[PDB]
Every structure is written in structure tokens, then in C-alpha cells.
Design a protein around this motif. Structure first.
Motif, PDB file in Angstrom:
ATOM      1  N   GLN A  70      10.550  56.847  34.054  1.00  0.00           N
ATOM      2  CA  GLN A  70       9.162  57.160  33.726  1.00  0.00           C
ATOM      3  C   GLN A  70       8.334  57.283  34.992  1.00  0.00           C
ATOM      4  O   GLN A  70       8.484  56.472  35.898  1.00  0.00           O
ATOM      5  N   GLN A  89       4.968  57.440  37.510  1.00  0.00           N
ATOM      6  CA  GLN A  89       3.684  56.768  37.642  1.00  0.00           C
ATOM      7  C   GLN A  89       3.710  55.544  36.741  1.00  0.00           C
ATOM      8  O   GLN A  89       4.732  54.864  36.702  1.00  0.00           O
ATOM      9  N   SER A  90       2.645  55.271  35.998  1.00  0.00           N
ATOM     10  CA  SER A  90       2.495  53.890  35.592  1.00  0.00           C
ATOM     11  C   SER A  90       1.173  53.497  34.985  1.00  0.00           C
ATOM     12  O   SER A  90       0.368  54.332  34.610  1.00  0.00           O
ATOM     13  N   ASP A 118      10.361  49.975  31.504  1.00  0.00           N
ATOM     14  CA  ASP A 118       9.415  50.140  32.597  1.00  0.00           C
ATOM     15  C   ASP A 118       8.318  49.080  32.603  1.00  0.00           C
ATOM     16  O   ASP A 118       7.392  49.123  33.419  1.00  0.00           O
ATOM     17  N   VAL A 119       8.393  48.148  31.668  1.00  0.00           N
ATOM     18  CA  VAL A 119       7.262  47.260  31.410  1.00  0.00           C
ATOM     19  C   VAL A 119       7.661  45.817  31.534  1.00  0.00           C
ATOM     20  O   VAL A 119       7.075  45.061  32.296  1.00  0.00           O
TER      21      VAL A 119
END
Ligand SMILES: C[S@@+](CC[C@H](N)C(=O)[O-])C[C@H]1O[C@@H](n2cnc3c(N)ncnc32)[C@H](O)[C@@H]1O
Lengths: 227, 121, 366
Positions: C118, C120-121, C248-249
Motif C-alpha cells: 500500500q 503512502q499512509s 499496513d496498520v
RNA sequence: GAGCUUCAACGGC
RNA sequence: GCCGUUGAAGCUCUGACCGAAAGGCGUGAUGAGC
């Protein structure tokens, strides 16, 4: 006031910085790129990056007198646990252009940091993967000369044996940094390393076991040979 | 040399705080452990908080540093979790501790704070 | 017999001789993302077909799922990991790819990676909070729409209400079957319905008190059913994404309690950061917000746990130990959450084993 | 119904 | 400056022990209404 001397290991240099103290450094493969915030120095024309034993482990190992270092210019290496790439950038300086690295990193937000760096460093392939399931990177990689493993997982001994059957070419070596509490936080460290050493030796020959203090507490770095 | 320590601390200081506890462990009110410490900070008042530099996973105390500018409380680092455990009156260790009521150390608790406000800068 | 590569899929006999090879027609990383995970794609399937009419009935791949999908497709298949193929591609890659082989292994390698990752963020934790609140909103509506479809289509075939209590089943009836007269063996058994079921039904159908329905009053009860079937599909799309986005978290949180329960806690907390800063005493009782209030109010016995009740080890163990395993878990979440928030390095396997083992303790002493 | 964070008035060293 | 009876408003499970010992435990013992 820094003077750079060659180090017994090729692609590893010794520096004596202003205060007369010795430190170790590799030569920057891509001049003008800071990978982890490392101190960079200039010898005659070129950048050398100080490899701090405190931010690295391969690094702590080398400062602690690691005898066997299979990772040399030209060599190909499968790097398990590559992360942001702090230490991996160093072994990318050593390996050089004619070398190859396959980074395998399980957690994506982290491997991501490494990706944009590999644009200029064309000798690392960042590979999202789980070092436990070698097969799931099977088409991504190719037989290597060396396996570096810094993963801090409970199966890391086996993780190394499994990859070693798959990718580690006969006559090649592997090296693995073991964090004691990571395998068992109940049993005693010299006992964990005992068991890890026996486990490893069912497949490999264990040729060196180098405790990593003062830089890391209770870690040791084994280097093994695949027959 | 961890990454959640946002500044260096002297031979003294780190020694000064350590005792700042022992005179609150009797005269004042103190709470030990990273949770009760964390509570004490969002609980909005604990006067000073102490964080060992040897901690691992090094993230279990990583939240206190940000949390303390939030609630705007000063923090400092001792070098050893164990030194701080026996400091706070327990045979096991403490990754951190908070000073609720300074007690005798009120003056001492006070001075240590201002030494911290310089080098947080 | 068969191993993949950065160029195409390859087939070797027992001597290592190259039989046939199919270059990827699609984007190499897109086929690979599939093949590596164990799923089967066009160029492979189209491959071993051209192989089947060769004189080769015998197949062995490098992955246990590739083998499943292949025999479940009629081909005899087995699994030997390093096998005569992979050993050949990954041994003498230049033989196949030319001297830039590593360079190619590069273009694809990083290509598959930037595809798996994924970009960016930065609010993606607050997005998982939608997907979750959304995910369980799509439950409150599927239950409404199904209550209707039931009451509605029961005018025409009242009996079916109790012969199909499993909603997705009832709903596939209305959608697929439509008018009550479209019932018959073949279509009922394709619903996956059983036998006694296929027998009842007709016994309550063939004689029914239901009102009559014109192809017009039917098509609109079908457009209701067909809609709920779209909501069931949107549910899965919300699940797949809660999963894929915890990577991603909170990889640690996900690996520890599951993608779903972890999104819950991130939700009660208000974000990954708000969940980091929490004393594990707080995390213990997250979700219990009501039963907590009547603690600090009526001085009632405090809830031994919130949302985390969902953890198998807590809800399948006697009430004797629930409280202890409660904070035993709360502690490890506190950490996974703080690792997740700050670095995202994956320590979960240590966290689990430290927790499994604490749990045996709790069990052994009671 | 407890408890801490906080803010007008009140008692006092 | 400290301190106190307060008053609406907002926040908050508890926190040093379990073991006959061996051990475990503030990196969370113990009690406890998802
Ligand atoms: C670079 S090392 C340690 C870095 C840290 N500064 C210490 O010292 C650990 C890395 O291995 C990764 N990792 C953990 N388990 C893994 C697995 N099973 N397979 C591949 N990578 C893994 C983690 O994401 C982590 O970034």
C-alpha cells in the motif's frame, strides 16, 4: 582528521576518526545516499559509511572479531529479515555491482522504507515475503552464496535450514543472529544457543558462535556451512 | 543507546531521580509499572515520571515520551530497570514509574524538573 | 516437473530436460502474485494442457495448493519442494534468461513488491475504522432486507420460512428459483441443499396455501433477493480489505487476535495511536463501555473483559480463569499495539508463544 | 453514590 | 505560596501478590458484570 585503512575483509574499511579511535566502515556504492542516518566520511574522492556496531549486528559481529565472513564482492546473498535495510545497505556496499541480494521482509510498512532506496542500489531486490514459507518466494529468487538471517522469530533455526535446502548453494555458508528471549524467555541463554547449535548441525556444520555483547545483550551470531 | 531516549543524561541526574523515588516511597504517593505510570499521566496529574533505558521490546515504554508533552509532565531516564525496581520497593524490575506525591523530595522533585526542561530542547 | 520464474512457467522431466515453457501473456508480477500463493492461472493451466497431450500424465509442483487445484482439476499432482524444475531455473538462470537475468529478476521483483504494498499512509488506521463500522452496518441492513424478503416472499410460499432458516440459503432460493413452480430436484440440489431438505420443501410446496404471483410480482421480489446477494458480496469485500489493510496498520495486532478483533479495538480506541497510549487495563475492558459505567457508578463487579471476549482462549475456558487470561492477553495487545504504532516490525510470534505459555500456567494452577 | 484532572466562593499557616 | 469545605463541567477497572516448595510476578501477582 580521519584516516581510512583497508580492513582484513574486502569491501570493509577501518577508520580512525578525530579522537584516535578505530571504527569500521564500508564504501558507499551509491555516492550521496543516506540510508539510515549513518555518518558518512570522505577519503580520497569517495564516500565511506561508518558501520555502527550499535545500529547493526553484522556490524557488532565484525567489531567483535568475526573470523568467517563469506560475504564479499561479487557474492550473491539471500537476506532474511531485511527490514528498512540498515545493515543490508552495508552488505550491499560489500557485495558491489557484480553482486546480488534478495531481501525478504515480512512486514510491508517497513519493507516500504527500503524500496525507494533500491532504485539507485540496483543490487537489492526488495521482496515482500514470509521467511517461513520459502516456496512463496520461489520464482523471485535464485540459488545464493550466502544466507544472512536476522529475524528474531522462535523457528529461526528451522527457518534457516528450510531456506538452506531451497536456495543455499552447496559449499555456501549462512549466518544467523539469534536473540535468546525470542526463542525461549524461560530457558537460559547459553542453553538456547546450545539447542540452536544442535538443531543447526543436523543440516549444517556450525563453524563459529560469536557472542554479541557489548553491543547487543544476549544475542549470538552463528556461521554455518552447507556441505 | 535506544531510539526512544530523546536525550543524554549525566552520571548524576540519573542518580538524583533514582533516590527522588525512595523518599517518596515512604513520605509521598508513588505508583510502579508502565501501566499505572501511563494511567498516572492521562490521569492528568503525576508530578514526574521515570523511564529505564534498558527495555525490550524497546517499544513497551515508547509511548510515555510522546504522552508526556501531551499532558505536559516532565520525564527523565535512569539507566537500569532493575535499579529502578528496587528503588521503587519491589524485588522485580520497573520499566518506568511515576511520582504522584513527592513528599520529602518535593524540593528535590522540583529542581530535577527544571534541569530536564533545558535538554528536552 | 513444474516450477515458476520471472519470465514464464517451465516444465522439466526427471532428467532436467526442458519440455515446454509458457511465457506470461499477462503482466509477469500479476500472474506471479497468484501462482506463488498457490492459486492457479491461465498460462499454467493452458500449459499443462499442452503437456497432457504429450504423453505426460504425471505432475509435481513446488506448492501444496498448486497440487490441490491441479488434481481437483483432474491432473495427478504431487508436492516435492525443491524439485527438478526450480532447482534448474534457480540454479542456472542465465541458461534460460540471458546474462541480464538478475536485472530481470529485479524489474519483476520490485514490481510485484510495489504491487503487494500500500502506498503512502497515514489515516489508513482510521479507514479500517470505517471498513469495520461500515462492515457491521452492512450487517444491520442485510438483516432488515432479509426480514422483508422473508415476510414478502412468504405471501407466495409461506412454508419456506422455516425450511430455510439459513439466510444466505433462503436468499439464493428467491434469487435463483424465483416462482414457486420453478422448483424441482436438479435446481434444489444445486443450491447445495441437502436431501431431506429437497424432499421436504416439495412436500410443502406441491401442496401450499401461498397466494399466486404473476411474473411481474415475482421479478420484484427477486430484485430484492438479488440485492441482498449484492450486500453479502459487499460484506466479503469489506472483510478482504480489513484483512489486507491490517498488514499496513497493525500486523502484530492482526497476527495476535485476528484482523477483525484487532480492527474492533482500534475502533474503540479511536485510532492506532489512541490504542497505543492505553494502559493494558483499559485495553482489557474495551467495548464494555456500558458495564464499566455501572462499575464507577453502582460500584458493581467490574467487567473482566470487553471486545476481547471474542478471543477463543477467553470464551471457551471456564469462568474460573477468564479474568486472568483477560489481562494476560490485554498486556500482549498493549505491546503489539505499541510496536505496530511505532515501527511495525513483526514480533507477533514471540508475543503469541509468551501468551500461549502464560495461559497453560493459568490452566495448570486451577 | 467512590475516585483523579480541572475552575468562581469559603476556612486557615 | 501552602491549604481546605466546595461547585457545576470532563476523564477513569483494581495494583503486590500467587504458590507446600520449585518457581512465577510491576514486560502486571490478585479480585472483578463482554
Ligand atoms: C532487522 S531485524 C531487527 C531490527 C531491530 N533494529 C533490532 O535490532 C527484524 C526484522 O525481521 C522481520 N521479520 C520478522 N519475522 C519475519 C519472518 N517470519 N519472515 C520475514 N521477515 C520477518 C521484521 O519485520 C523485522 O523488521
Amino acid at each position: 582528521m580521519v584516516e581510512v585503512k583497508k580492513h582484513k575483509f574486502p569491501g570493509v574499511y577501518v577508520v580512525i576518526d578525530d579522537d584516535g579511535s578505530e571504527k569500521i566502515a564500508t564504501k558507499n556504492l551509491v555516492p550521496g545516499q543516506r540510508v539510515y542516518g549513518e555518518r558518512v566520511i570522505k577519503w580520497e574522492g569517495e564516500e565511506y559509511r561508518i558501520w555502527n556496531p550499535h545500529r547493526s549486528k553484522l556490524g557488532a559481529a565484525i567489531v567483535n572479531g568475526l573470523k568467517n565472513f563469506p560475504i564479499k564482492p561479487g557474492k550473491s546473498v539471500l537476506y532474511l529479515g531485511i527490514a528498512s535495510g540498515t545493515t543490508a545497505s552495508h552488505v550491499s556496499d560489500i557485495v558491489g555491482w557484480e553482486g546480488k541480494i534478495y531481501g525478504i521482509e515480512f512486514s510491508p510498512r517497513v519493507l516500504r522504507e527500503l524500496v525507494p532506496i533500491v532504485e539507485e542500489r540496483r543490487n537489492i531486490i526488495p521482496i515482500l515475503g514470509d521467511a517461513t514459507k520459502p516456496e512463496e518466494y520461489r520464482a523471485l529468487v535464485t540459488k545464493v552464496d550466502v544466507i544472512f538471517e536476522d529475524v528474531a522469530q522462535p523457528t529461526q533455526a528451522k527457518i534457516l535450514i528450510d531456506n538452506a535446502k531451497a536456495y543455499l548453494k552447496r559449499g555456501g555458508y549462512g549466518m544467523i543472529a539469534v536473540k535468546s528471549r525470542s526463542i525461549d524467555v524461560t530457558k537460559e541463554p547459553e542453553q538456547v544457543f546450545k539447542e540452536v547449535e544442535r538443531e543447526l548441525s543436523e543440516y549444517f556444520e556450525v563453524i563459529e558462535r560469536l557472542n554479541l555483547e557489548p553491543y547487543e545483550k544476549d544475542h549470538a551470531l552463528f556461521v554455518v556451512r552447507k556441505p | 543507546k535506544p531510539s526512544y531516549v530523546k536525550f543524554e543524561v549525566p552520571k548524576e541526574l540519573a542518580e538524583k531521580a533514582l533516590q527522588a523515588v525512595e523518599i517518596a516511597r515512604d513520605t509521598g504517593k508513588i505508583r510502579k509499572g508502565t501501566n499505572e505510570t501511563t494511567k498516572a499521566v492521562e490521569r492528568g496529574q503525576a508530578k514526574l515520571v521515570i523511564i529505564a533505558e534498558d527495555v525490550d521490546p524497546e517499544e513497551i515504554v515508547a509511548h510515555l515520551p510522546p504522552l508526556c508533552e501531551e499532558k505536559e509532565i516532565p520525564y527523565i531516564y535512569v539507566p537500569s530497570k532493575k535499579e529502578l525496581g528496587a528503588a521503587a520497593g519491589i524485588e522485580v524490575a520497573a520499566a518506568s514509574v511515576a511520582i504522584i506525591e513527592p513528599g520529602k523530595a518535593r524540593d528535590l522533585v522540583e529542581e530535577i524538573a527544571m534541569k530536564v526542561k533545558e535538554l528536552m530542547k | 516437473f513444474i516450477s515458476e520464474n520471472v519470465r514464464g512457467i517451465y516444465a522439466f522431466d526427471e532428467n532436467g530436460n526442458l519440455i515446454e515453457k509458457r511465457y506470461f501473456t499477462d503482466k509477469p508480477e500479476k500472474v506471479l502474485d497468484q501462482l506463488l500463493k498457490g492459486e492457479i492461472t491461465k498460462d499454467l493451466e493452458e500449459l499443462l494442457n499442452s503437456l497432457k497431450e504429450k504423453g505426460y500424465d504425471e505432475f509435481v509442483f513446488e506448492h501444496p495448493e498448486l497440487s490441490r487445484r491441479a488434481k481437483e482439476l483432474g491432473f495427478s499432482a504431487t508436492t516435492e519442494f525443491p524439485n527438478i524444475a526450480g532447482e534448474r531455473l534457480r540454479s542456472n538462470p542465465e541458461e534460460f534468461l540471458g546474462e541480464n537475468w538478475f536485472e530481470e529478476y529485479y524489474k519483476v521483483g520490485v514490481a510485484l513488491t510495489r504491487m503487494r504494498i500500500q502506498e503512502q499512509s497515514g489515516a489508513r488506521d482510521k479507514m479500517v475504522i470505517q471498513a469495520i463500522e461500515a462492515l457491521d452496518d452492512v450487517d444491520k441492513v442485510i438483516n432488515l432486507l432479509v426480514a422483508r424478503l422473508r415476510e414478502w416472499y412468504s405471501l407466495h410460499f409461506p412454508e419456506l420460512d422455516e425450511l430455510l432458516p439459513k439466510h444466505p440459503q433462503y436468499v439464493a432460493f428467491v434469487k435463483t428459483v424465483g416462482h414457486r413452480d420453478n422448483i424441482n430436484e436438479e435446481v434444489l440440489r444445486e443450491l447445495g441443499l441437502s436431501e431431506e431438505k429437497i424432499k421436504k420443501i416439495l412436500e410443502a410446496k406441491e401442496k401450499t396455501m401461498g397466494a399466486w404471483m404473476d411474473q411481474t410480482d415475482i421479478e420484484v421480489v427477486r430484485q430484492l433477493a438479488e440485492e441482498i446477494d449484492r450486500l453479502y458480496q459487499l460484506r466479503k469485500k469489506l472483510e478482504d480489505y480489513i484483512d489486507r489493510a491490517m498488514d499496513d496498520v497493525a500486523p502484530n495486532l492482526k497476527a495476535l487476535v485476528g484482523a477483525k478483533l484487532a480492527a474492533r479495538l482500534i475502533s474503540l480506541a479511536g485510532g492506532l495511536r489512541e490504542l497505543a497510549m492505553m494502559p493494558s487495563s483499559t485495553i482489557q475492558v474495551l467495548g464494555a463501555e456500558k458495564a464499566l459505567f455501572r462499575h464507577l457508578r453502582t460500584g458493581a463487579k467490574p467487567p473482566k473483559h470487553g471486545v476481547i471476549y471474542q478471543y477463543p482462549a477467553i470464551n471457551r475456558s471456564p469462568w474460573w480463569q477468564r479474568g486472568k487470561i483477560a489481562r494476560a492477553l490485554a498486556g500482549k495487545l498493549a505491546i503489539a499495539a505499541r510496536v505496530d504504532y511505532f515501527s511495525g516490525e513483526y514480533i507477533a510470534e514471540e508475543l503469541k508463544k509468551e501468551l500461549e505459555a502464560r495461559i497453560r500456567e493459568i490452566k495448570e494452577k486451577y
